[PDB]
A = this chain, B = another copy of it.
């Protein structure tokens, strides 16, 4: 199941972590702060990220992706699959 959900950066970030693996493509959610923004928007560990702000990052470096995430200010909107 896919989830499109927009997150609004909280007292501590969006309250989650990006994680990638070392020469696998793709970037995924791992640590979701209970009650944090990512959590309330429905995200769950290991949800795989597909679009950031409408852009597909599947073929993009973990670095590039983290950066695109921070580059959106108060908000970032994510399409994931889990």
Contact = CB atoms under 8 A, between A and B. Distances in A.
Interface in A3-60: 21-24, 50-51, 56, 58
A81 interface: yes
Contacts of A23: 50-51, 56, 58, 79
A50 B22 CA distance: 9
Contacts of A24: 2, 50, 58, 81
Interface of A: 2, 21-24, 50-51, 56, 58, 79, 81
10 contacts: A2-B21, A2-B22, A2-B24, A23-B50, A23-B51, A23-B56, A23-B58, A23-B79, A24-B50, A24-B81
